[PDB]
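Appendix C reproduces, verbatim, an entry submitted by the partner laboratory led by Prof. M.T., so that reviewers can inspect both the input and the predicted structure.
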Amino acid sequence: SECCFQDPPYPDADSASGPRDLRCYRISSDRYECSWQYEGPTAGVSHFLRCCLSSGRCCYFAAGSATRLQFSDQAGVSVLYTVTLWVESWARNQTEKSPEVTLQLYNSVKYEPPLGDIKVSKLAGQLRMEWETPDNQVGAEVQFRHRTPSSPWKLGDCGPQDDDTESCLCPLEMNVAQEFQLRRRQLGSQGSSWSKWSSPVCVPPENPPQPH
């Protein structure tokens, strides 16, 4: 993969569908990976990873239908200094853009949600979740989302974390089933993107409605 420092072969975007959740990180001594998702039907859609250097020079990788792409530090993209990255999709005769991500790629780590046991218990009128920190990922911003069978996802903040274990306080609803998920973001100044959501924490109702 070489980043092509030319005008992209399509017009600029002028849509409800499109690419989103761009995550870029280093994966080895000299290789990097960007990952994203696409909202909407994927038929005939292709993706381009865009990059602008601080000098204003910009380039693109053509990814085809893939939603993930790897490149080395010889691809023309600076990794030691800050760059700006985003995804453009050619879909149904129109260009669509993701939000940008501004980061120093060399210090950007692939952060992951809790992967394994998530302990859940009651603390006063809240739920407390606790998990062991993913290896070599100490230091994180952590968010949760929660829902009930009827309600949609509502997002929340767990606060910053700095230890071998991490925790979160969440709303407790005794009379309905609850589902929670957790995601983690790298701390620091180099730039960060949210990890994927963890597997669910499922908390059945302790006082479900009863006949009288």
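DSSP finds no helices and 15 strands in the chain. Additional entries are available on request from the coordinating office.
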